[PDB]
Amino acid sequence: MLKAGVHFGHQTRYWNPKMKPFIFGARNKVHIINLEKTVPMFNEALAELNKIASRKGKILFVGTKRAASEAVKDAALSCDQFFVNHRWLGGMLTNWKTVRQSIKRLKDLETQSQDGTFDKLTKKEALMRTRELEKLENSLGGIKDMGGLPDALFVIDADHEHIAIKEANNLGIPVFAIVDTNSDPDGVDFVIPGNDDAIRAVTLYLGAVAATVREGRS
RNA sequence: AUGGCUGUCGUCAGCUCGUGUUGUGAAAUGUUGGGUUAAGUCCCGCAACGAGCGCAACCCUUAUCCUUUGUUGCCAGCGGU
Numbered sequence: 001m002l003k004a005g006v007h008f009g010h011q012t013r014y015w016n017p018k019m020k021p022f023i024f025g026a027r028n029k030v031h032i033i034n035l036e037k038t039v040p041m042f043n044e045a046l047a048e049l050n051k052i053a054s055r056k057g058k059i060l061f062v063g064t065k066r067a068a069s070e071a072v073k074d075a076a077l078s079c080d081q082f083f084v085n086h087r088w089l090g091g092m093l094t095n096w097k098t099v100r101q102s103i104k105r106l107k108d109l110e111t112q113s114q115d116g117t118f119d120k121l122t123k124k125e126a127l128m129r130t131r132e133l134e135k136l137e138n139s140l141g142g143i144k145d146m147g148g149l150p151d152a153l154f155v156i157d158a159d160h161e162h163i164a165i166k167e168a169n170n171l172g173i174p175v176f177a178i179v180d181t182n183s184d185p186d187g188v189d190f191v192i193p194g195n196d197d198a199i200r201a202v203t204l205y206l207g208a209v210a211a212t213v214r215e216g217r218s
Numbered sequence: 219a220u221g222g223c224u225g226u227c228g229u230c231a232g233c234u235c236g237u238g239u240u241g242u243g244a245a246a247u248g249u250u251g252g253g254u255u256a257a258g259u260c261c262c263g264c265a266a267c268g269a270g271c272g273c274a275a276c277c278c279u280u281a282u283c284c285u286u287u288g289u290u291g292c293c294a295g296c297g298g299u
């Protein structure tokens with residue numbers, strides 16, 4: 001709701017002509033996003049995104065670059081929602097089938113880990129198995145309790161996370177992206193011209209989104 | 219014309235498949251890349267995710283120690299011989 005405070009746009013380099021409607025674009029070789037265009041765009045994204053959030057849907061924040069972590073873990077986990085913060089595996093939506101059995105192995109190995117037989121029979125293989133929980137835990141972290149493929153997708157950079165956008169367009173999932181002036185509005189259904197790599201901007205930004213996901217009529 | 223059995227490349231480290239994706243297609247990817255290994259060995263990365271046959275291990279023997287039993291095998295300590 002609050003006016004974007006401190007980002008005003010970025011990316012002098014590799015700017016994309018399809019971002020030409022969103023650029024004010026003056027200072028010191030770098031491009032300034034027209035935030036007077038961003039505010040209606042971002043309010044629309046909060047509108048439809050709250051609309052699917054009230055229908056009891058799953059949202060899947062996507063935060064692979066740094067420092068979108070742990071800001072996407074903090075914002076998704078502040079809601080009762082899901083996230084990807086480390087490397088987004090190629091095909092966790094379009095073959096979720098195989099990713100379902102990898103999530104199943106993460107559940108079986110944490111149940112085996114903190115409760116069952118973890119000290120049993122070996123030290124070396126037990127260390128092997130625990131670092132399998134680090135690898136499967138940081139890759140399949142947020143999505144491990146989803147149990148479906150989600151009803152929306154909220155990516156924090158459109159060019160850095162083009163794979164996830166490409167799959168959610170492949171599957172008919174609404175993509176909500178904060179694009180920058182280098183990115184491309186591929187199949188992003190609700191584009192938001194913003195700043196992808198400022199931590200102030202993405203914490204303000206995810207703060208608003210996580211605010212409207214759990215917003216409660218009460 | 220065959221079965222069964224065998225040699226050989228070669229005990230060389232390779233050969234594939236399902237699902238997915240890319241290509242009009244033959245096909246490609248996976249299996250390539252940075253390291254490493256005896257080894258597609260293992261890690262990391264990655265439009266791939268996994269799986270099979272192979273590699274490794276399980277088998278026999280050899281190298282050390284313990285327990286048991288001690289004949290026909292052995293003789294340290296005992297006695298005479």
